[PDB]
Design a binder for these strands. Structure first.
Lengths: 500, 389, 152, 50, 141, 13
RNA sequence: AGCUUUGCGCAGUGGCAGUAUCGUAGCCAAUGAGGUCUAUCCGAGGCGCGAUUUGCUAAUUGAAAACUUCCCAAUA
RNA sequence: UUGGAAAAGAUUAGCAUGGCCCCUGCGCAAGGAUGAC
């Protein structure tokens, strides 16, 4: 073989594992500062992922297949192979974009606060794509508008006369050299200008200074590994803006806020107005929780870094949620476990009759008292040159196609599947139609009793053609008894049929 | 490949030949200089390395073709008398060991399925999951899957190929880009490779059962190479008075290798010797497989004097050649004493008795793959006699 | 016509004409502005330079000529290389120089002695191999014939 | 030995029993799960299993 | 050799740039005397019959037609520049500028890939085609 | 054709 | 007079679709390409190229994912 | 009805068309079988 194998001494499957370096991995993780310390230099904080154990990284799965299932040229292949390098650079960008890591070459991203102290083409491209479609200015404007709305929601009680945003240039939301005032809200009274201190401080100190107009400002920053100290940097920025040569704020008692977009943090160390510091804190907390532009930016950053948290799955229907499936949301209790219908009959001598039987699938809606049976001919399941996984995929595709045949207005809002492993193929087959939630139903209902019916069972045995004929599962309870009562009666009837 | 342009003017042909000779000389000098620089550790690139590797591979192929042509012209290097003496010594050694020959695989071998599965697994492990596979690679994988599907039919086809296919196809030849010691990479035909792997697994199992390979043949599964070195070190001191130089005794451990052992393997002698151990039909099949047309790019040459290392049967062939060479070097009495009695053979680097350890200057000897190492504790009188001789 | 017609713009100061030693090539004084007085001044300057360069000129020239003659033994020009062939190559006639096709379309028997030696060695070995005790042989005829004795 | 022109497909409009058969047999859908996740919190395999 | 016909006249070269529009036009401004331009011509001959169906490469001599070396300022011994339908495409080599290659590319595959990427970028209209190579370094080790 | 250009280039080198 | 054979072309239906459908332009080929049965028997395909083309609809991402003006203000 | 400022169209999936294999109705060749006081 033309490949040099360094393990020329012995084989792992012949002599055994001669080393165990897992302890080395644990020691390297701990000695770097633990998981939290390692991620601190990374951009995990900006992703707003509060689960350091649940998040899953898409290994070579950021795109569809990075165009691997294609016949592109060599240049496209090289670009695809170099794409993971950009993601790796972006992941460890804060530890590498620090001005103390490279030489002083401070360059600010156009129309953005990203001050890339250096020239890393991969990380530069990743940052530019992350802030695509003029995201920085829009995010700043959205933050300002959200703060203004939050203030004006209960500004009357907080002694506010009139709140209006000043005429701030678009280039005044990204240029750190020259600042301005974001909110210009009047107070209708001699608002005692409290001493300019950090909002994180709990000290109530107010110097003998009063005025009428109080200003509030907001700044956007992308802090590095060392520039993540939002409180101190914000205090220094406010102090410099107080005596700024060109940042001519109208109110000298004008507080300023900062957003650590890179590290997902916010702070404000300006003149906290009497009774407004808790209001500013609550507004900032609510924004950082659910800021629209910030949420969009965090989603884009998560997508760019090939990181996507494992979304919660649909819960199982226990004995308490048994009756929850009768609501207006249409639920089709899909249970096609008995689709493997064949006749293994011991012939008199020589062999046994290996004649497959015509199978079927079960689709019933207790939420509406419906029953639709799709029969699977034995010819489709015999001689197809495939394993059982292909048959299961075909069954899931048939279920999805039957759902698509049903109108969208009649699409089942929930799809309870008895088969445990059939949920993933069901979601994959009809990912284009995600209005149906594949909820788990651990307690399997005896829906197989239809296959033992005098009419339904005989039809299923002889239904050599795929028929989507409907039926009434409830004998008369659809228009006579309650829907939950109808489901209970159907369950009792099926249990009696299965009993003996 | 000869350049024949009979429709061209004679002066034009002469000029073309002169230009070709000049370019060949320049290319040879450039390739030698680049190989020297690479061996020394000069700064090169991927394009330069690829070009130098290609030129070196072409030069090595041409040199091997010339060497094979000269071997055919000069005939067998080994004389008839020396070959007969070597065969007699090997026959005597085998008779003393009473090694029952490994017969052809019976129609109902107990472990035939296990050996076939092991060979198929060992051949499949080479095909790691890559971006894609070549058409020949795809055909090889398909044949492996088919063999894993019908083991009985695959074994029948392997037996038919072994008993009949005495003229195989062309085996490819590529050179691993090792900076210091370039090594070849020979790829056999897929069905031929499967047959060779089955034959090699069967021969190794039969040799292990019959104890064909001797203990001093070092590379084995029992002792890894570092453990082999540790065991040699431990057993060196275990000899009686292995350090007492007070009486003038001196111990000399000679570390040597058989230069060109793989290259200088007489195919006819290999056929004549392996038939004494392996099945006559199987030995003839292996000898025929040893002779193939090495194909690489536009260059194709035959092989008559060197065993191909790419073939899966090389391990057994190289082991038998090394055993013959060791029996020649160690001697009949010394090898017999080192291998103990046939009924109760001695372990590695161990003598049947303390007296049998000091019965000759040769005390410890480990015949690695193309690398010998003999520890000799020559007495003062013995050392003086050897120096005088 | 200039290159402006193509509508192209940017993105003897050539680098080849330039160098570290002596800067760029060429003469800073244009060869145009000459005259008869220029001829006289140039003649006087050249005569002075030649006079001041004749100290070791004879010995240096002789040594350099000898060195060039010596180097001619180991330094053949590419042209010189094919010079002998190119001289004779002109002898090809017009028919010979037109029939050149497109490139798209007693004695010593060395192997005889080798074959004889191999046959002798094989015969000697077989004579030695005829003395073997229990060398086994599985007949391919029987094995192939009995191969299909357990086939489905 | 010509070189194919640097041209690609125009647009996609067909799918299902016309182009889905090729994308299901030749470019068959793989697992697409349990082989692309990394579980950045835990470590499933050994430290140097590779 | 130099099978690629060098456009002797500057105006002839300009018309040749205006001649073909559906393919890639590459002009080798290197002087044929220097060995570096000889290596560039050899690399072009390697891709002479390959990129022919997608490109039309012409040689040039800065001594013959000086206007190209005085207006475009091609001072390198052998600089490879591109012009597509009266638009000099820029290859993002990363060497500070993108007007020329300026390197004796001895790899035929690299030149072929660069030509293909330049053609793709010209089809996409990008005046600065991102070169799929790390030309900013020597790419040797 | 190319012969003249090749000869011109060769004569200068 | 009614039907029907090779069936043809039209239109509908059923199914198949990477091994396949076809051009195959490169080549052999009704003047035999191929062999364990059949060998004094059989008689028309095979090697290599390339795709499986015509449109509509939903969704999907994006600020905009397109078909002849637009954001605004007291009224009519 | 009245009144002021003004990606060089992409990704993903099904449906039919489309390709061939079967039949049918149509149109008709050369025929095949029959009724003709």
């Amino acid at each position: 073989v033309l490949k040099q194998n360094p393990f020329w001494w012995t084989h792992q499957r012949h002599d055994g594992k001669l080393w165990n370096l897992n302890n080395y991995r644990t020691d390297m993780i701990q000695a770097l500062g633990g998981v939290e310390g390692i991620l601190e230099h990374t951009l995990f904080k900006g992703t707003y992922f509060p689960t350091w154990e649940g998040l899953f990284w898409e290994k070579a799965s950021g795109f569809e297949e990075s165009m691997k299932w294609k016949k592109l040229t060599n240049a496209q292949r090289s670009g695809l192979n170099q794409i993971p390098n950009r993601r790796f650079t972006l992941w460890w960008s804060p530890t590498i974009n620090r001005a103390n890591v490279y030489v002083g070459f401070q360059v600010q991203l156009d129309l953005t606060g990203i001050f890339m102290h250096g020239k890393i083409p991969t990380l530069k491209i990743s940052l530019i794509q992350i802030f695509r479609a003029h995201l920085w200015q829009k995010i700043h404007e959205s933050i300002v508008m959200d703060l203004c709305q939050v203030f004006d929601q209960e500004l009357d009680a907080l002694e506010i006369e009139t709140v209006q945003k000043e005429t701030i240039h678009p280039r005044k939301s990204y240029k750190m050299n020259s600042s301005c005032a974001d909110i210009l809200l009047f107070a209708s009274y001699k608002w005692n200008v409290s001493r300019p201190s950090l909002l994180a401080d709990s000290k109530d100190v107010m110097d003998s200074t009063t005025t009428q107009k109080y200003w509030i400002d907001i700044q956007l920053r992308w802090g590095d590994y060392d520039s993540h100290d939002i409180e101190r940097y914000a205090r220094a920025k406010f102090l410099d803006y107080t005596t700024d040569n060109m940042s001519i704020y109208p109110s000298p008692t004008g507080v300023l806020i900062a957003i650590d977009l890179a590290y997902n943090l916010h702070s404000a160390y300006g003149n906290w107005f009497p009774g407004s510091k808790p209001l500013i804190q609550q507004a900032m907390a609510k924004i950082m929780k659910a800021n629209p532009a910030l949420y969009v930016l965090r989603e884009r950053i998560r997508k760019g870094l090939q990181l996507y948290s494992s979304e919660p799955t649909e819960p199982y229907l226990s004995s308490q949620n048994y009756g929850e499936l009768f609501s207006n949301q249409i639920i089709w209790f899909v249970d096609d476990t008995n689709v493997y219908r064949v006749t293994i009959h011991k012939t008199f001598e020589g062999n046994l009759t290996t004649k497959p039987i015509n199978g079927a699938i079960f689709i019933f809606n207790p939420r509406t008292g419906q029953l639709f049976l799709k029969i699977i001919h034995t010819s489709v399941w015999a001689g197809q040159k495939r394993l059982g996984q292909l048959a299961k995929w075909k069954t899931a595709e048939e279920v999805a196609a039957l759902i698509r045949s049903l109108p969208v207005e009649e699409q089942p809002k929930q799809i309870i599947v008895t088969r445990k492993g059939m949920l993933d193929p069901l979601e994959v087959h009809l990912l284009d139609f995600p209005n149906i939630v594949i909820k788990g139903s651990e307690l399997q209902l005896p829906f197989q009793a239809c296959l033992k019916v005098e009419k339904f069972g005989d039809l299923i045995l002889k239904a050599t053609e795929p028929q989507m004929v409907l039926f009434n599962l409830y004998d008369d309870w659809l228009k006579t008894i309650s829907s939950y009562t109808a489901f209970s009666r159907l369950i009792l009837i099926l249990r009696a049929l299965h009993v003996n | 490949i000869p350049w024949k342009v009979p429709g061209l003017p004679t002066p034009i042909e002469n000029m073309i030949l002169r230009y070709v000779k000049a370019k060949a000389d320049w290319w040879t000098n450039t390739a030698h200089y680049n190989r020297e620089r690479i061996r020394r550790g000069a700064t090169v690139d991927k394009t330069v390395c690829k070009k130098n590797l290609g030129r070196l591979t072409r030069l090595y192929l041409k040199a091997e073709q010339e060497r094979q042509h000269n071997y055919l012209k000069d005939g067998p290097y080994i004389t008839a008398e020396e070959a007969v003496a070597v065969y007699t010594t090997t026959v005597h050694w085998l008779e003393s060991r009473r090694f029952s020959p490994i017969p052809f695989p019976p129609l109902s071998y107990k472990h035939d399925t296990k050996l076939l599965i092991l060979a198929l697994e060992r051949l499949k492990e080479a095909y790691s999951v890559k971006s894609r596979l070549n058409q020949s690679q795809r055909e090889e994988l398909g044949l492996i899957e088919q063999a894993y599907d019908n083991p009985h039919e695959a074994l029948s086809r392997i037996k038919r190929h072994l008993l009949t296919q005495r003229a195989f196809k062309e085996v490819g030849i590529e050179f691993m880009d090792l900076y210091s010691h370039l090594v070849p990479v020979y790829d056999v035909e897929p069905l031929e490779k499967i047959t060779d792997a089955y034959l090699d697994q069967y021969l190794w199992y039969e040799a292990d059962k019959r104890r064909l390979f001797p203990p001093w043949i070092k590379p084995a599964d029992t002792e890894p190479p570092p453990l082999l070195v540790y065991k040699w070190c431990q057993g060196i001191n275990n000899l009686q008075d292995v350090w007492e130089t007070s009486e003038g005794e001196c111990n000399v451990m000679l570390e040597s290798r058989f230069e060109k052992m793989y290259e200088k393997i007489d195919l006819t002698l290999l056929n004549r010797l392996l038939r004494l151990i392996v099945d006559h039909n199987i030995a003839d099949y292996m000898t025929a497989k040893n002779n193939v047309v090495i194909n690489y790019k536009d260059m194709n040459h035959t092989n008559s004097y060197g065993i191909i290392r790419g073939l899966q049967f090389a391990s057994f062939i190289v082991q038998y050649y090394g055993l013959v060479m060791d029996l020649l070097v160690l001697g009949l009495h010394r090898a017999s004493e080192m291998a103990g009695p046939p009924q109760m053979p001695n372990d590695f680097l161990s003598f049947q008795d303390i007296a049998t350890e000091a019965a000759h200057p040769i005390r410890l000897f480990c015949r690695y793959i193309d690398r010998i190492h003999i520890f000799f504790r020559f007495t003062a009188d013995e050392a003086r006699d050897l120096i005088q001789r | 016509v200039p290159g402006l017609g193509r509508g192209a713009t940017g993105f003897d100061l050539n680098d080849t004409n330039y160098d570290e030693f002596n800067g760029y090539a060429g003469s800073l004084f244009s060869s145009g502005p000459y005259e008869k007085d220029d001829e006289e001044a140039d003649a006087i300057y050249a005569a002075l330079d030649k006079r001041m360069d004749e100290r070791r000129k004879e010995r240096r020239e002789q040594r350099e000529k000898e060195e060039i003659e010596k180097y001619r033994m180991e330094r053949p020009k590419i042209q010189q290389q094919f010079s002998d062939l190119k001289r004779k190559l002109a002898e090809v006639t017009e028919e010979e120089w037109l029939s050149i096709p497109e490139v798209g379309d007693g004695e010593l028997d060395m192997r005889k002695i080798g074959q004889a030696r191999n046959t002798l060695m094989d015969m000697r070995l077989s004579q030695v191999s005829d003395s073997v005790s229990g060398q086994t042989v599985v007949d391919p005829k029987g094995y192939l014939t009995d191969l299909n004795s357990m086939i489905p | 030995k010509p070189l194919p022109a640097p041209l690609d497909g125009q647009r996609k409009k067909r799918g299902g029993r016309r182009y889905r058969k090729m994308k299901e047999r030749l470019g068959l859908t793989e697992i697409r799960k349990q082989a692309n996740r990394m579980s950045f919190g835990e470590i499933e395999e050994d430290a140097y299993q590779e | 050799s130099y099978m690629l016909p060098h456009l002797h006249n500057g105006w002839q070269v300009d018309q040749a740039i205006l001649s073909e529009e559906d393919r890639v036009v590459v002009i080798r401004f290197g002087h044929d005397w220097d060995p570096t331009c000889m290596k560039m011509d050899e690399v072009l001959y390697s891709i002479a019959e390959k990129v022919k169906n997608f490109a039309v490469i012409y040689l040039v001599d800065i001594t013959e037609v000086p206007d190209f070396n005085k207006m475009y300022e091609l001072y390198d011994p052998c600089t490879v520049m591109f012009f597509f339908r009266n638009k000099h495409i820029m290859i993002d080599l990363g060497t500070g500028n993108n007007n020329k290659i300026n390197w004796a590319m001895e790899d035929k595959q690299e030149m072929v890939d660069i030509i293909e990427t330049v053609y793709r970028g010209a089809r996409k209209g990008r005046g600065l085609v991102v070169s799929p190579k790390d030309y900013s370094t020597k790419y040797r080790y | 054709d190319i012969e003249s250009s090749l000869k011109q280039l060769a004569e200068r080198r």
